[PDB]
Design an enzyme around this catalytic site. Sequence first.
Site, PDB file in Angstrom:
ATOM      1  N   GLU A   1      13.408   7.336  42.062  1.00  0.00           N
ATOM      2  CA  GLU A   1      13.146   8.116  43.237  1.00  0.00           C
ATOM      3  C   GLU A   1      11.793   7.905  43.898  1.00  0.00           C
ATOM      4  O   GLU A   1      11.659   8.155  45.086  1.00  0.00           O
ATOM      5  CB  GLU A   1      13.263   9.595  42.824  1.00  0.00           C
ATOM      6  CG  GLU A   1      14.640   9.910  42.267  1.00  0.00           C
ATOM      7  CD  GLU A   1      15.663  10.109  43.338  1.00  0.00           C
ATOM      8  OE1 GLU A   1      15.167  10.012  44.544  1.00  0.00           O
ATOM      9  OE2 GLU A   1      16.823  10.368  43.114  1.00  0.00           O
TER      10      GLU A   1
ATOM     11  N   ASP B   1      14.995  10.469  53.345  1.00  0.00           N
ATOM     12  CA  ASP B   1      15.634   9.778  52.260  1.00  0.00           C
ATOM     13  C   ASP B   1      16.469   8.588  52.772  1.00  0.00           C
ATOM     14  O   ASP B   1      16.455   8.221  53.937  1.00  0.00           O
ATOM     15  CB  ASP B   1      16.316  10.712  51.240  1.00  0.00           C
ATOM     16  CG  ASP B   1      17.661  11.308  51.620  1.00  0.00           C
ATOM     17  OD1 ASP B   1      18.218  10.731  52.633  1.00  0.00           O
ATOM     18  OD2 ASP B   1      18.222  12.190  50.983  1.00  0.00           O
TER      19      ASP B   1
END
Length: 162
Positions: free
Chosen positions: A11, A20
């Site tokens: 991540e 994202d």
Amino acid sequence: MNIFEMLRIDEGLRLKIYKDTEGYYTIGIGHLLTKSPSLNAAKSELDKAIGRNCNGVITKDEAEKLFNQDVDAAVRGILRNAKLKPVYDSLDAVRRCALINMVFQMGETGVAGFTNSLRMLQQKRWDEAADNLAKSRWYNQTPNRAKRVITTFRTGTWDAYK
Ligand SMILES: [Cl-]
Ligand SMILES: [Cl-]
């Protein structure tokens, strides 16, 4: 290697609101803020989450606090889920990490939808479950991360991350 080091590799860490891969407003270590297009809807969610006026920026400590909550929430969700619980209990320690990784990323509901794959992991048909997991939007959208997870399931070692 542990679940935290694993998710930190997958991540990244960002101290400022960002989008994202799907276009959503995120911060820290994969902490989704909102699916709403508004940077403002995001800044507000962020202040609610941290307990302060952040103006889209947080400290490392704050990112790590959010990360600890998210991993815990992920584990409790699996153990509370009638479809996920049995799979989790049946698995060894490494593979358990792989399931937590998908849950963190895609939510309980998402993973619970991979019916066939779940059935194969439970039966310990590794290669078959790896092949079926690859037939998903998930794998097509974030192939490098999917592959890492998938190898973890196929092999039961941390090789992909080392
Ligand atoms: Cl497909
Ligand atoms: Cl990727």
